[PDB]
UniProtKB/TrEMBL annotation, chains A, B:
Zn(2+) 2 binds at residues 61, 233. The lineage of its organism: Bacteria, Bacillati, Bacillota, Bacilli, Bacillales. This is triacylglycerol lipase. Zn(2+) 1 binds at residues 61, 81, 87, 233. The chain holds residues 300 to 681 of 690 of the full protein. Keywords: Calcium, Hydrolase, Lipid degradation, Lipid metabolism, Metal-binding, Secreted, Signal, Zinc. It catalyses: a triacylglycerol + H2O = a diacylglycerol + a fatty acid + H(+). The gene is lip. One of its GO terms (biological process) is lipid catabolic process.
Length: 382, 382
C-alpha cells in the first residue's frame, strides 16, 4: 500500500552528492529548499528513493553502481572492464533498496541530467548484457555479475530524463573535458580521499582513498600513477558530444518501457542569432551558457545553462514523438518529448537555484506530482 | 599634474574593508570587478584615494579616523569621549595621504552609504570642534587634537553621498542593531581580533585584539568586560532612525561646500501599497528590503535593499533642491538631490553585485566619471 506499485528511483547527475554523502553545508540535491522531493512525495504516500552513485565517474561505472544500489551487494565493474581501464574491479558494497529485484518486480527510473544517461546504460546491460564480460568470463571462468548476463527484462517500467545531455554538451567538449579541468577535478577527488574525509566523490576505484598510515606525500606519489589522469572512463568524457554519441550508438529502445524527456530553456537570441543566458540562469552556468550559445551550428545554441536543447530533447538516433502537457505520457518504446520549460535552467529542474525567485516551490511541487502522475498511469495502462 | 586640483577621498560605509585590510578572498569595495574606481580614475589622470576607517564603529570613531587617514598621525578619539564610552583614547596611527592638509588645501569627499554620514561628522568637527572635548581640555589641561578645537575651514570642497542613510534605516532599528545581532557582530569582531588575524574590523579600541601570549580563553574573559556589548558608540546604533537623527541634529550647512546626493530604488509596489525587492536586488538584502517595504508609513517604504529612498535623498529638514542630471550641480550650502537611479540597489553603487548583469561596467564607469565631472565643475566655479 504505497500509491505506486513500483518503487521510484531518482538518479542524480554529474556533480551531485546526496544523503549521507553530502558535505556539512551543501544543497539538498532533489529539490533544494524549494520542494523536498523525497520527503514530500513520501508524506504523500509514494514509495520513492534517491540513488547515490559516483559523482565524477563514467556512465559505465555509475550504471553498475546504480544496479547495486537497487539490488544490494558489492559493486562489480566487471573483470574485462577493470583490466582494460586500469581500476579496481570491486567497489563499495550497498545495502540494497529492493533486494528482491528481478524480472516481474519493476522499478520506475528518473534521472536528472547525467542520471538519465546512467539509467539508459544500466537498462541496456540488464536486457542485452555486456559482450566483453560474457566473452571474458567464458575465456577466463570465475564470476560474472548478473548485471552483465543479458536476458533480464520486465525490470524497469519507465525511464524519464530531466535536462539529460543525450547528445552531450559543448560545455564538456570545450571546458571541462579539457586537460586542465580534468586535473582540477581529479585533484579534488584526490584531496577528498584523504584519511579525514567522510565523503566519497566516486573515484576511489582509481586509488583515491588515502590509507590510515599512508603519508599524504606517499599518497600523492602513489595516485599520480593511476590511469584516471589519462583515461576516458570518466564523466567529463562521457558528457562530451563524442562520449554521448558512443552511448547512443550502443543503446536501443526496449518496446516494453515508457520513455519520457523534459528540457529547459534559459537562454535568448541576441541581435546576431547567438544565445545568451537569461537573467535568472544560475550564475555558475553563465560562461558555459555563452560557450554553448555561440556555437557555429545554429541548432546547437538554445540551452538550459549547460546542456543545449537539441541534446536534452532525445538521443538523436532514437525514435521520438512530441507530446503536449495534457497527453497521457503512456506510449511504450519511443521517447515522449515534453514541451520545453521556458525560463527553467539546468538546476531549476532540481530546485537548487536559491537565487532565482521566479522559480518557486509550489511550481516545482506540481512538476514532480506531474511526473508521479504520469508514472501512476504507466502502472494503470499495463 | 592631476586633472583635479583637490584630491578625491572615497569613504566606504558600514560593512566595508578596503586595500590591504581585506581578507584573502573578498570583493573590491570601490567598483567590484565592474569598474575599478581607484585604479581607472588614476589611469585617466585623477588624484583619488580610498579611505580605510572602522568597519563596525560609530560615525564618531570613523570621523576621527578619517581625519587621521587624511592628515596622518595617531588617532585621538578625545579624552572626554574615551572616558564617557569606556574605550581607548588612542588608536591606530596612519601615514597620511595629505600631511599638508590645512585651510586652503581642500579635498573632495565621496561617501557610500554610512561613509556619507562619516564625512558630515568630520566636517562638523573641523568647523565647530567638539564641545565636550573643548570643555574637557579647559577643565583638565593636557592636549587636545586640533580636530576638536574648531575654526578649520576651506579644507573641504565637496560632500557627495551615494545611498547614504541620512535618516537611518529600519534595517538597523529592526535587525542588526537588535541585541541578538549586535552579539553576532561583536563575536565576529572578537574573533578577528585573534593573534593570527591580519584584518582589523574596526573595534580594537574596545579591547578586541588578543595579546601575543594571551590564551583565547583569557581573551574571551577580558573582553567580555568591555562596554562595547551595551554601548551606543557603534555602527548599528548610528544607522538606526534615532542614531542618524542625532547626527542630523548636531550638523549644519557649510556655505562654501558643494553638497550632492544620489539614491537608488530597487523595490516595486505590491497590490496593497507595500514594497518588495525587484529581482536583481543583491540577494542578501531581500529580507531587509521586505522589512523596510512593509513599514506602516508609506513614504518610508521605497528602498534600495537596505536604505529607504526617504533616508537617502537628503538629511531631513536640511535645505535641498532637486536637480536634473544635465544641469551644473554647482550650488553651495544646499543638498543637491540627483534623480533616483531606477533599478539600482544599495550595492550596485559600488559594483559588487556580481549577480546582476543589468548593471554593466560601462554604466558604473559613466556614473563615476560624471561625479568627477561635477567635482571638476566645483573646482572651475570657485
Ligand atoms: C545581511 C543578512 C543576511 C540574512 C538574510 C536572511 C536570509 C535568509 C536565507 C537563509 C540561508 C542563508 C544563510 C545561512 C548560511 C549558509 O547556508 O551558508
Ligand atoms: C576552493 C579552494 C581551492 C584551493 C586551490 C588549491 C589547489 C591545489 C591542488 C591540490 C591537490 C591536493 O591537495 O591533493
Ligand atoms: C559562518 C561561520 C559562523 C560559525 C558560528 C560560530 C559562532 C560562535 C561565536 C564565536 C565567538 C568567537 O569565536 O570569539
Ligand atoms: C584560529 C584561532 C586562534 C586561537 C589562538 C589562541 C590560543 C590559546 C588557546 C586557549 C584554548 C582554546 O583555544 O580552546
Ligand atoms: C571541503 C568540502 C569540499 C566538498 C567538494 C564537493 C564537490 C561536489 O559537489 O561534487
Ligand atoms: C575568516 C574570514 C573573515 C572575514 C570577515 C568579513 C567581515 C566584513 O566584511 O566586515
Ligand atoms: C557544488 C554544488 C553542486 C549542485 C549539483 C549540480 O550542480 O548539479
Ligand atoms: C546588517 C544590516 C544593517 C543595516 C543598515 C545599513 O546597512 O544601512
Ligand atoms: Ca534559474
Ligand atoms: Ca542589483
Amino acid at each position: 500500500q504505497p500509491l505506486n506499485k513500483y518503487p521510484v528511483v531518482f538518479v542524480h547527475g554529474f556533480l551531485g552528492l546526496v544523503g549521507d554523502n553530502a558535505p556539512a553545508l551543501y544543497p539538498n540535491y532533489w529539490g533544494g529548499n524549494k520542494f523536498k522531493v523525497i520527503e514530500e512525495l513520501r508524506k504523500q504516500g509514494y514509495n520513492v528513493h534517491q540513488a547515490s552513485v559516483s559523482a565524477f565517474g563514467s556512465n559505465y561505472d555509475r550504471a553498475v553502481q546504480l544496479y547495486y544500489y537497487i539490488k544490494g551487494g558489492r559493486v562489480d565493474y566487471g573483470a574485462a572492464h577493470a583490466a582494460k581501464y586500469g581500476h579496481e574491479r570491486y567497489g563499495k558494497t550497498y545495502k540494497g533498496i529492493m533486494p528482491n529485484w528481478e524480472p516481474g518486480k519493476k522499478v520506475h527510473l528518473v534521472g536528472h541530467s547525467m542520471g538519465g544517461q546512467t539509467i539508459r546504460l544500466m537498462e541496456e546491460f540488464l536486457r542485452n548484457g555486456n559482450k566483453e564480460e560474457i566473452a571474458y568470463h567464458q575465456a577466463h571462468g570465475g564470476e560474472i555479475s548478473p548485471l552483465f548476463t543479458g536476458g533480464h527484462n520486465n525490470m524497469v517500467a519507465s525511464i524519464t530524463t530531466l535536462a539529460t545531455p543525450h547528445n552531450g554538451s559543448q560545455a564538456a567538449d570545450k571546458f571541462g573535458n579539457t586537460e586542465a579541468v580534468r586535473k582540477i577535478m581529479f585533484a579534488l577527488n584526490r584531496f577528498m580521499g584523504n584519511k579525514y574525509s567522510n565523503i566519497d566523490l566516486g573515484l576511489t576505484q582509481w586509488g583515491f582513498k588515502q590509507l590510515p598510515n599512508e603519508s599524504y606525500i606517499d599518497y600523492i606519489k602513489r595516485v599520480s600513477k593511476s590511469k584516471i589522469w589519462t583515461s576516458d572512463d570518466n564523466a567529463a568524457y562521457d558528457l562530451t558530444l563524442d562520449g554521448s554519441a558512443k552511448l547512443n550508438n550502443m543503446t536501443s529502445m526496449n518496446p516494453n518501457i515508457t520513455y519520457t524527456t523534459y528540457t529547459g530553456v534559459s537562454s535568448h537570441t541576441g541581435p546576431l542569432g547567438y544565445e545568451n543566458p537569461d537573467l535568472g540562469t544560475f550564475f555558475l552556468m553563465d560562461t558555459t551558457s555563452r560557450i554553448i550559445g555561440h556555437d557555429a551550428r545554429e541548432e546547437w545554441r538554445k540551452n538550459d545553462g549547460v546542456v543545449p536543447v537539441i541534446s536534452s530533447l532525445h538521443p538523436s538516433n532514437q525514435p521520438f514523438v512530441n507530446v503536449t502537457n495534457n497527453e497521457p505520457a503512456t506510449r511504450r518504446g519511443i521517447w515522449q518529448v515534453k514541451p520545453i520549460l521556458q525560463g527553467w535552467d539546468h538546476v531549476d529542474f532540481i530546485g537548487v537555484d536559491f537565487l532565482d525567485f521566479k522559480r518557486k516551490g509550489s511550481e516545482l511541487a506540481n512538476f514532480y506530482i506531474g511526473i508521479i502522475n504520469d508514472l501512476l498511469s504507466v502502472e494503470a495502462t499495463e
